[PDB]
Backbone:
DNA sequence: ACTTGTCGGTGGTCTGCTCTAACGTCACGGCCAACCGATCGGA
């Protein structure tokens, strides 16, 4: 599904914008999708969705003063999505654990990350 | 008589409120009170009821209740 | 309008509701569902949208309106929606740097990218 | 390729209609209780 990926991307992009104070345009255009051209087209579509009634004060808001994209109204969308059962989380955990490289982040990074991810899931 | 509390009497009043179950939802006793100021909720404890010993005037909130409203234009 | 707009509006509406919203109210209230020709096209489209949302991972629960109401509606548990807290930052940098290096299977790379994006949306 | 509307189906709950073959057969639970004047229908 090529729509589901976009939907998940937006559902994570809104919390990302609300959690990084005044993120510049380049950081968003390089992190969430390399194509910065479609970033504006995705922001335009995000500007149209909001709470039922779809009046000002219900749709999500923003400030394009310059490069910084800040969100003033989120319409309840503040937290990211939960890592789906197995799937993404399973693959990430498997890759993190089955690494065939001699330990370099083993002391307090790899094991800590594994334990924290397992507890979070 | 006023100074020495000769003809002075104590009168006790009882106010009771119940949170029932309605068809549109359930009624919750809490200190949320959608549209009020912040100093009105100063004598209410964590569970939304006044504190013992707190002086109450006319119109002061004793128990904070709220009911489902439904969809209204 | 657009399918993505319908999905986003439905997600937001089901997130912000307090009681189980029935499908009849979903048709009139949520934008994009009011352009259907008849009640069967809307029903099938809403069923497909529910299937997609449930398969994605978003918790979409179906239950009664209330005790004294026989209508059946839908909600989204905001508490089960995700887990806010995150751990340290140094380990996450190593995890991201090793997230994907040579894997070619589309499912694996898409899953890793989704996990990385969710981690970025939950801090770095 | 993805979406979408028409087609068809399984299963479940709320609501309404019909039927049941020994013989059976003419209601109660209860005062009213003043006390005046006016008036129509009986005797």
Residues:
């Amino acid at each position: 599904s090529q729509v589901s990926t976009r939907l998940v991307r937006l559902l994570n992009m809104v919390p990302y914008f609300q959690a990084n104070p005044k993120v510049t345009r380049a950081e968003a255009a390089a992190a969430l999708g390399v194509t910065g051209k479609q970033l504006d087209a995705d922001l335009d579509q995000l500007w149209m969705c909001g709470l039922p009634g779809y009046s000002p004060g219900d749709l999500i808001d923003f400030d394009f003063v310059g490069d910084t994209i800040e969100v003033t109204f989120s319409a309840g969308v503040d937290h990211p999505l939960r890592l789906t059962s197995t799937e993404a989380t399973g693959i990430l955990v498997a890759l993190r654990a089955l690494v065939d490289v001699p330990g370099m982040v083993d002391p307090e990074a790899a094991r800590s990350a594994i334990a924290k991810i397992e507890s979070a899931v | 008589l006023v100074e020495e509390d000769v003809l002075t009497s104590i009168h006790i009043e009882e106010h009771e409120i119940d949170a029932r179950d309605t068809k549109l939802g359930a009624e919750e006793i809490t200190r949320d009170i959608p549209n009020v100021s912040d100093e009105v909720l100063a004598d209410l404890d964590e569970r939304g009821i006044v504190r013992i010993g707190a002086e109450v005037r006319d119109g002061d909130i004793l128990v904070g209740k709220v009911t489902p409203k439904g969809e209204t234009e | 309008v657009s399918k993505v707009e319908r999905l986003m509006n439905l997600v937001i509406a089901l997130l912000s509701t307090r009681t189980y919203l029935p499908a009849e109210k979903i048709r009139t209230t949520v934008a994009g569902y009011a352009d259907s020709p008849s009640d069967e096209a809307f029903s099938r489209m809403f069923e497909r949208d529910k299937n997609e949302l449930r398969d994605l991972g978003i918790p979409l629960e179906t239950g009664r309106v209330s005790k004294w109401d026989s209508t059946e509606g839908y909600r989204i548990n905001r508490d089960s929606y995700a887990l806010p807290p995150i751990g340290l930052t140094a380990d996450e940098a190593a995890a991201v740097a090793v997230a994907t290096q040579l894997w070619q299977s589309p499912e694996l790379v898409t899953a890793t990218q989704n996990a990385v994006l969710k981690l970025r949306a939950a801090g770095v």
Remarks:
- Strands of chain C lie at 21-22, 61-66, 69-75.
- Residues 3, 36-38, 40-41, 44-45, 48, 70 of chain C lie near DNA strand D (CB under 10 Å from a C1').
- Chain C touches chain B through seven residues (CB under 8 Å).
- Chain C is about 50% helix and 10% strand.
